[PDB]
Amino acid sequence: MSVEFEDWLTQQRWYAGRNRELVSATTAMAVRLRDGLELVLLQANYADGPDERYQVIVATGSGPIDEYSVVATIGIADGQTAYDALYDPDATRYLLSLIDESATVQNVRFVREPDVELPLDAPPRVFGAEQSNTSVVFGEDAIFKLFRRITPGVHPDIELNRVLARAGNPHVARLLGSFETEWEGEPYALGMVTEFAANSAEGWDMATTSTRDLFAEGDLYAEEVGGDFAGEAYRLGEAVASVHACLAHELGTEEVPFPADVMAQRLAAAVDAVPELREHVPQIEERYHKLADTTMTVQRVHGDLHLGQVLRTPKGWLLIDFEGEPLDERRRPDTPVRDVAGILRSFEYAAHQRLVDQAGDDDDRARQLAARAREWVTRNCASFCDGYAAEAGTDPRDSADLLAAYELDKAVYEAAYEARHRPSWLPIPLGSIARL
């Protein structure tokens, strides 16, 4: 089952079973798309930990170009080497003409919205392929994205892109089409195609260059420097507020009380990998049980906002990767105060990764950089909240206690997620927990 070809499916980076200790891992499906193609939906069973099902559109014969052979040659089936079709131009063309038809094959049905797909253009594969997807760019007009780890749909990165653009909200790259199948019982969304924001730049990469400005040739104030991100942060505020207000219109709103017992379970489990976090825990729990038996407003939200999931194009900010992150729990509504917590959380990480990279970069007076970072971190958080509050009547800082809770929770999840993976990060969550 799988046989040696399996080895390739563990070299990925989008493969999560790197630590999971597997039992039998076997191919669950193989629809035939073309003579030399097959949409294989593999399934990986682990011992002690839930099953996870990946996909791979495998092609046979010869798999050019020469500049991908390392990152492409899956193995050798009798008697030509097999390779994943995201690296072949003749193959991705077909997989886009199938979305255009809009066609179906055995089980995998392809659908497209009432727009125009853009074939007959040269496609390459994008470099930063993520831990849940892979991406190829057709020309400068559209980008195709096959979900490397399919879990039983519906997929919010498709769902929430649709209603957002159907409303006309400008802050999402427009969705063109997608494709899914019905493996066993429930359905599985397999990938989407979307309008390419050619000429884009990540938020984290753009904040990193402003945080780079103050710090290098520093001791000159956070407002005086040219690099000042404050203006751009404010725009990003009303951008996130726009999508939230628009999402609440179609998704609707409900009232619910603060998840006291649920978020206590989070802080309790976080204390398993305990540091000085146990010393803050009573003061943190005092902040938690202060907001007990209080009602909030819950909308459909992004779920995983940080500067990385936000892109800047000419004439607008774009929100991407509605991942969001238990698919049932992912779709569940939540206080928008969690999303603004995510962005404000991300600002401190952008400023202090640099300060760690400026402790890099040692020794005598890193105290100056901290002074500038605290300046920068608190100023763009202000500028962001100001812009958010300028869009919708509601101000997030006006209901601060609710936000301060979710910021503290995002820090507890940040501590545990960092501490296990990277020990060097631990000062960032711990110090920021101390700050708040």
Binding site: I65, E67, A122, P124, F127, A198, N199, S200, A201, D205, M206, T209, S210, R212, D213, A216, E224, G226, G227, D228, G231, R235, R312, P314, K315
Partner: protein, 569 residues
Amino acid sequence: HVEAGIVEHPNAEDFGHARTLPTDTNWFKHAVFYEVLVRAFYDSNADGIGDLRGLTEKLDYIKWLGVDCLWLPPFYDSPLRDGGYDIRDFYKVLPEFGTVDDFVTLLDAAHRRGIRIITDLVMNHTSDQHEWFQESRHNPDGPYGDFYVWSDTSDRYPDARIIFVDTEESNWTFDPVRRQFYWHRFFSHQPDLNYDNPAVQEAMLDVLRFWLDLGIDGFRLDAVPYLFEREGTNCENLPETHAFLKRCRKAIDDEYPGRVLLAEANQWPADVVAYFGDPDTGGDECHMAFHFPLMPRIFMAVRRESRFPISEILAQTPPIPDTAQWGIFLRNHDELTLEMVTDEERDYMYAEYAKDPRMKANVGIRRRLAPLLENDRNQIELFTALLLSLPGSPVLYYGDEIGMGDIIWLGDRDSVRTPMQWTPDRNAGFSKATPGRLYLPPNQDAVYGYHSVNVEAQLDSSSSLLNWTRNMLAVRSRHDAFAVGTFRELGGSNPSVLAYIREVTTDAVLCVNNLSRFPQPIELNLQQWAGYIPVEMTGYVEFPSIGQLPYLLTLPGHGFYWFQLREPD
């Protein structure tokens, strides 16, 4: 001018006409304009005031620099209460500059070496000393009584704003001789011409025809948005205003093919596109208008070390007609009103500018390129490099080629109108007259002083800014792509690097500019030119051929590269 009952008026046929250049209706799209004041450039009669004959003598320098067209600000007879933008006589050159004959001598001498000349021409208003206005006030029932906008109360057009809100209390001023109010958008001594009077329209069309008969290559029509005034409107960009401009274009196209009409309209790009005219006919108004907010954006883009303030206005600029061409220069203020263009709604950088300490310091004052960038040579090169490679025809301001400075204390507009610094000799080699006689003093500070900044000094080392600037124009003239090619922004992963491609269907050229003061790497996607060989233009050096993988280029702080994309063999 004169008067008998009508204000008499000289004939084009009494002066000669300079050697005509071969008729070409696209010269302005390929040209590089050089704005030079007549008073400032060179003085040949030792009066202390630059003159037409002096400018004639220095044409060889202009030719050597490699500019294609001279742009002269207004040189007509004037009381000079508003820098000569208040014209007293349209058919007479100001005495101190010379006679109309001396202008023809300049034209012929310039055309002989292929250099064209255009001039500022104020359309909206004349000086209150103009014979017309003196006849209008003194003889209200005469033939000029309706040449200006008169009224019995200062109530009309109340929606129109006062342009100079700190100097003028009203747009209506009371004339004591006529005992009536007269309209003026600008200063009280610059009364507005009444364009509703058909005779006025014909008079101004005859002014155009006069200088066109002498053989001038074009005009920059100043203050045109304020020509017509209508009730219930702000009296700006009214349909009848555009309708008159269409006549001027027709008169050019019918009588003098191959001449140009520039529109000084200090408005947001989305508004000024109307001044190119009906796009169905491919243009029937002005040939050129100025893309005013480019420089402020480029400036703020280098400040932020982010490409996007440049990208944004380039993306938000509407397409223009086929004949049409944008005009771009490296200044933040309009020389007429001393106002920086901005739109509260459509400019996203609206509040941003006032918050910047550098921008805030020079609000309302003309500054040269060198002082604007704090004399940073690397920046001066970058901004120049952008000016020459971005879409539209560029305008250089005199003295910027040698990195002259300014004297802000002389006045908000005079600051950039000091004498041209030719040598480190007495008066910077501008005049033989005693220093006291000079119309304006030369720069004397340790940085931009004529002892250290002059043409003579820079002529020798090919590393000088003059020689650098000269050569950049020499490179630009060797590729049409820069002038009239397409513009596609390449983007890239690094926000600090602005990369784009100009193309003609016969070069493709690649420009990579680094807006950050630190060295920056950029990975570009040039798959479309796979197999092509990039060749750097200033050194004719071949770089590695473009492949399927992203192409990596590394620039120094405020550096740039210009590559010719050359075919494989």
